[PDB]
Design a protein around this nucleic acid. Structure first.
Ligand SMILES: [Mg+2]
Ligand SMILES: [Mg+2]
Ligand SMILES: [Mg+2]
Ligand SMILES: [Zn+2]
Lengths: 104, 251, 292, 131, 156, 145
RNA sequence: AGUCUCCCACCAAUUCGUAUGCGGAAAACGUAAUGAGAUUUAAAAAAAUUGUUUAAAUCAACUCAUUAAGGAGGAUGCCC
RNA sequence: AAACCAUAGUUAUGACGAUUGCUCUUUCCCGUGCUGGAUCGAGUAACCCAAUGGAGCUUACUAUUCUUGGUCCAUGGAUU
RNA sequence: AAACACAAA
């Protein structure tokens, strides 16, 4: 297998995983979201490449694995709400009953 | 050593019966060995949250499968009770009389359209399906297909040890290690299909309709689909027996 | 089903040119094997090891199944396969299997020495192990080696068609067959007929009678000619056609479109299979309900 | 527990190529017998020569041979081995056993010679049952 | 030199060892057999299978994992009745891990009794068992040093 | 695994075919007149070639091919006319029938072959040969009186 | 069958004086209750054994981490 | 110079004949049934083999190349 | 052949 041809295959596979992470059900169903998240991460761990932190921090959830999205293609919103600090700013989701807290 | 070997032989001819047995089979060691016999914080955070997400998604998939299993049974029972045959009446009746059991039911018309296209385009770009078909190479294409991902793929069971599993078409929702998960549609059938891979034959057809109406005829073998590489290469393979494929020739 | 995998081709070196009489005799013997009854025939081609392999791909196979066997099959009704036997005795540096293995279908070996036997049993990727039944056996064959080989793959082949050549060769043939059957534990045995003319061919009953007189039970002969021959054809076919048993280039719909059975449909200059669109997403999944 | 088989039948048929030499010469019963006597002596010694066999319903390239149940192996190993050479034909002869039977139940044509042989064989059958 | 020092350890060569000592072997054989020394036949016979034994391994032993984990827990780390047995087992495990070679080979590197300070722990726990208020003269006073008393039940 | 061997002990006996001379009727007299001696033209390759010819002449082609796989003469000396023929446990009957059907040596005539002991090891064959040799001496000592 | 382990002299003790889940003289020995784990792990992946050689929807299987023997009192659950 | 010792013991464990039983199939009867009975037939497996004795573990076997018991949030058909 | 070894392969 040519490495120049393997780079294109790697890019295509990464794009395909990232697209499968999205469309309707991974947003709707937490099971498919978590499964595809685990698959994408197991695929990116084997390629010995780090992933950007600016997306790594605020991309997915920690209990199910759905993308944090509040309210071309109308879909379902990802999070219950996003309050102010109120003591410390938190973000809640729809699928599970937990929240993620960040401090200023 | 020659006179020494003669002395050793004249000594062994007293104890042993064949003096030139050990020197021939190399049991008289010339040497006697004498020796006593002789930024990690965020990384750990990411590993732990990944472990937690995996452990949650497993249970979520399991309970989703169980919910679909029970919902299909209950809705088919209610349909037979109400005597309604086609799906376009049954789903509307359930929606207008049973709100809850309807948000648990899946929708094939929701599952087919983007999945099929997003997998077809991905495979077309991977196998380099071009308007002309003189730029192909079978070896590299088969290697890519062995390395390719089948998450959200359309496969048809064409041969199997069980005479009832054959002929089932479905699109992948998740790739397990022992069973294969797809979804099928019928008159009222909306069953999630789990199929064993040990002894079954699958196949996938890629449509190509630029000028003529042709398609590629590819196929996989589940029995030997368990010991393949995943997204990478360089895994030392072993010849197993190539012997339990008798069902392939038999029928 | 009956399979004969050692039909010899009248050529040993690439410098030789086959005359029309040999091709006519081969056509006659193929017709003879077909008339009485047979299912699979794989012709054999023999070359030695120390020779210079030609640095070509489109000239390695002087069989041209589509040229003349393409003339014969439409009237005959059976299939042909191209196989090669390697006469390897001394481990010289000449080794270019990466071309002849992919160009041919079945790759066998003909060891004469002990080192060649060991390397062909351990490292050489072959399909059948054939011995020189005309000459003397290289050594006292071991049991564990043959058992581990037949568990790892390659089986032994017995050719009863050589005993019809002369008188002095029959004793050596029987002595070698006895040792092979005794050392192989009667597991990986494949039977073939190495006849060059249709006059030295026999019926399946003569074959099973000869082998049952040799020492192997008749039911085992039937099983090894029915299932083991099909399996050794399948292995050598998909090891070259497909990848390492992971992805198959052929899709079996019914009962005739099989990777070893379907031979005119599947392309050989490439590995693609151009079929019309027959799988949609709107058709009912259940084949019992799906109607056209 | 088991019934003792007297002998066993064998369906013999000649296969001679070279249509010209084939239609040229015409084999007969004595030809068959000489071919068998040559095959047995070529493949075996006195062991093969002392094999009991008779001829029943000899035809053009067709004949039926009954061999004892104890010598079926010797007969079937010698038949598929020998190839005639310069006996009566310019093209050497090769024989292939079509089928075998141990219950006399075989019928190719609707002739009556099989019926007569069957009649004499059952008049011997009841005779060995009583005797 | 019949034995020398080399890469791994000491090497002893049989060749020179029996070469230098040859006349001694001749005198020994003459002292054992007088008239049979001139003859060369089979004097020694095969060992009976009843006396025949089997060969063991060249290693010392493999310690069970339970005792190893307990010794690890003890080394790395008024009294109730169970705390008496706890301290007793603690001193026993310390002594065992100190003497045993298999446990030493199963112990983790960079761990010694000096660093563990076994002696002070032994002293403290022995002081505790001494405080446990036992009554020795209630048990009995024996007659010999090896355990041998009389266990006879009269009418019971 | 083990190769199943079966050694065969045979004796060459010369019948005193002479009708013009009167003979003594006893045990040791006929034992001596039958165990006189073997001729000088007697060896291992001359007996092996003769038995190989007789095997092909009596059994045939396949009968000699199946039997000549492990047909060897391990021990034989012309002073006592005792030989040990190694063969398979399958072809023991064939070798015995061939030794029975032995007609004559190509230059020496008037002799018979007697198979005495058949066993699957050489130690028991040697023990039986020693026992037979010891038994032979008894009648000799008794008749020398 | 196997290039696995151990017994086949003893030692009121520099001699594994080891009352440590149970059985066992020992054993790279059998099994029982709970929790967790997957080259992101305590450790399986890019000493022996085995063609495939644990798992990675749930079950089943492997690995590791805890539970010392007997008698008495109180509470809870079952027939009563 | 012997300790020489096996309810197989040191390249051995042969040769056929006869009987019952076990699995399927083409038949007839009482009561449906009953390790209910009798004819026409096929097969009795494979791994494989001791060399001093015992225990534990792992690894090879049972597809017309004998069998048996149970389980399965495996699928296939039918009733509620 | 079997059986043995901190061998050798
Ligand atoms: Mg053994
Ligand atoms: Mg061994
Ligand atoms: Mg052993
Ligand atoms: Zn969540």
């Amino acid at each position: 297998m040519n490495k120049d041809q393997a780079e294109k295959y790697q890019e295509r596979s990464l794009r395909q995983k990232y697209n499968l992470l999205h469309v309707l059900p991974t947003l709707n169903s937490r099971a498919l979201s978590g499964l595809y998240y685990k698959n994408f991460h197991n695929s990116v761990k084997r390629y010995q490449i780090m992933l950007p932190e600016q997306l790594k921090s605020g991309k997915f959830c920690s209990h199910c694995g759905c993308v944090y999205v509040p309210n071309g293609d109308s879909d379902e919103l990802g999070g219950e709400s996003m309050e102010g600090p109120k003591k410390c700013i938190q973000v809640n989701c729809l699928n599970c009953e937990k929240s993620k807290l960040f401090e200023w | 050593d020659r006179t020494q070997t003669f002395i050793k032989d004249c000594l062994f001819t007293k104890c042993l019966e064949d003096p030139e047995k050990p020197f021939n089979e190399n049991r008289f060691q010339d040497t006697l060995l004498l020796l006593p016999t002789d930024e990690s914080a965020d990384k750990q955070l990411e590993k732990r949250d990944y472990q937690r997400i995996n452990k949650n998604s497993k249970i979520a998939l399991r309970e989703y499968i169980n919910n679909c299993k029970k919902n299909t049974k209950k809705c088919l029972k209610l349909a037979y009770e109400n005597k309604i045959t086609d799906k376009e009446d049954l789903l509307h009746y359930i929606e207008e009389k049973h709100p809850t059991i309807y948000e648990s039911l899946p929708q094939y018309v929701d599952f087919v359209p983007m999945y099929k296209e997003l997998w077809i385009n991905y495979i077309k770009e991977l196998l380099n399906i071009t308007k002309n078909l003189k730029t192909f190479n079978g070896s590299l294409a088969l290697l890519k297909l062995s390395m390719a991902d089948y998450n959200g793929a359309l496969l048809r069971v064409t041969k199997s040890k069980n005479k009832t599993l054959i002929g089932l078409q479905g699109i992948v929702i998740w790739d397990s290690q022992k069973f294969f998960i797809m979804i099928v549609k019928g008159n009222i059938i909306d069953e999630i299909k789990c199929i064993p891979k040990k002894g079954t034959v699958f196949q996938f057809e890629i449509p190509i309709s630029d000028d003529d109406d042709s398609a590629l005829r590819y196929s996989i073998l589940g029995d030997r689909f368990k010991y393949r590489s995943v997204d990478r290469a360089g895994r030392k393979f072993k010849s197993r027996r190539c012997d339990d494929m008798l069902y392939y020739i038999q029928n | 089903m009956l399979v004969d995998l050692n039909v010899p081709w009248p050529q040993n070196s690439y410098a030789d040119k086959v005359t029309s009489q040999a091709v006519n005799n081969l056509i006659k013997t193929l017709s003879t094997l077909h008339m009485l009854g047979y299912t699979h025939i794989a012709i054999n081609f023999t070359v030695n090891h120390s020779e210079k392999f030609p640095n070509d791909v489109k000239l390695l196979n002087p069989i041209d199944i589509k040229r003349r066997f393409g003339e014969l099959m439409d009237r005959t009704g059976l299939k042909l396969y191209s196989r090669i036997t390697l006469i390897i005795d001394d481990p010289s540096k000449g080794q270019s299997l990466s071309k002849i293995s992919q160009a041919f279908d079945i790759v066998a070996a003909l060891p004469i020495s002990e080192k060649g036997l060991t390397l062909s049993t351990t490292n050489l990727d072959i399909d059948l192990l054939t011995f020189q039944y005309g000459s003397r056996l290289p050594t006292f064959l071991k049991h564990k080696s043959i058992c581990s080989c037949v568990n790892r793959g390659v089986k032994l082949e017995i050719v009863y068609g050589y005993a019809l050549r002369d008188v002095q060769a029959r004793r050596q043939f029987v002595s070698n067959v006895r040792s092979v059957i005794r050392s192989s534990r009667s597991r990986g045995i494949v039977i073939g007929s190495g006849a060059m003319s249709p006059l030295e061919c026999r019926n399946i009953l003569g074959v099973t009678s000869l082998i049952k007189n040799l020492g192997l039970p008749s039911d085992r002969c039937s099983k090894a000619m029915g299932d083991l021959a099909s399996l050794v054809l399948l292995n050598g076919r998909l090891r070259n056609k497909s990848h390492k048993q992971t992805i198959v280039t052929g899709g079996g719909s019914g009962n005739g479109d099989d990777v070893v059975n379907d031979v005119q449909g599947i392309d050989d200059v490439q590995t693609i299979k151009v079929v019309k669109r027959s799988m949609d997403a709107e058709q009912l999944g259940h084949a019992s309900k799906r109607h056209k | 527990k088991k019934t003792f088989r007297e002998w066993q039948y064998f369906k013999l048929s000649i296969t001679s190529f070279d249509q010209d030499v084939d239609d040229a010469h015409a084999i007969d019963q004595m030809t068959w017998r000489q071919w068998l006597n040559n095959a047995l002596k070529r493949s075996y010694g006195i062991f093969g020569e002392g094999v009991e066999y008779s001829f029943l319903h000899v035809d053009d390239k067709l004949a039926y041979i009954r061999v004892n149940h104890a010598d079926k192996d010797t007969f079937s190993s010698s038949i598929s081995t020998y190839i005639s050479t310069d006996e009566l034909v310019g093209s050497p002869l090769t024989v292939s056993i079509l089928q075998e039977s141990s219950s006399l139940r075989l019928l190719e044509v609707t002739d009556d010679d099989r019926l007569w042989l069957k009649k004499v064989m059952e008049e011997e059958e009841q005779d060995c049952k009583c005797i | 030199t019949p034995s020398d020092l080399s890469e791994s350890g000491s090497k002893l060569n049989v060749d020179q060892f029996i070469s230098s000592r040859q006349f001694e072997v001749k005198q020994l054989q003459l002292a054992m057999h007088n008239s049979k020394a001139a003859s060369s036949t089979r004097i020694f016979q095969a060992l009976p299978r009843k006396l025949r034994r089997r060969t063991a391994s060249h290693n010392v032993r493999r310690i069970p994992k339970r005792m190893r984990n307990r010794a690890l827990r003890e080394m790395r780390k008024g009294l109730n009745a169970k705390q008496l047995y706890k301290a007793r087992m603690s001193i026993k495990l310390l002594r065992l891990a100190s003497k045993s070679t298999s446990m030493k080979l199963s112990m983790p590197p960079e761990v010694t009794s000096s660093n563990c300070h076994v002696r002070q722990k032994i002293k403290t726990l022995k002081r505790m068992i001494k405080e446990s208020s036992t009554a020795n003269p209630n048990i009995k006073l024996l007659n010999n040093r090896m355990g041998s008393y009389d266990c006879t039940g009269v009418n019971e | 695994v083990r190769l199943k061997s079966r050694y065969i002990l045979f004796e060459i006996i010369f019948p005193p075919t002479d009708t013009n001379v009167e003979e003594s009727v006893s045990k040791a007299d006929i034992l001596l007149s039958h165990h006189r001696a073997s001729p000088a033209d007697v060896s291992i390759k001359s007996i092996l070639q003769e038995i190989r010819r007789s095997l092909s002449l009596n059994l045939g082609d396949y009968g000699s091919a199946k039997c000549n796989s492990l047909l060897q003469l391990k021990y034989f000396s012309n002073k006592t006319s005792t030989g040990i023929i190694r063969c398979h446990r399958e072809d023991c009957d064939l070798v015995i029938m061939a030794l029975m059907l032995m007609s004559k040596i190509g230059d020496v005539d008037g002799l018979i072959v007697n198979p005495v002991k058949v066993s699957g090891t050489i130690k028991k064959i040697e023990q039986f040969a020693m026992r037979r040799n010891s038994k032979i001496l008894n009648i000799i000592k008794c008749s020398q009186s």
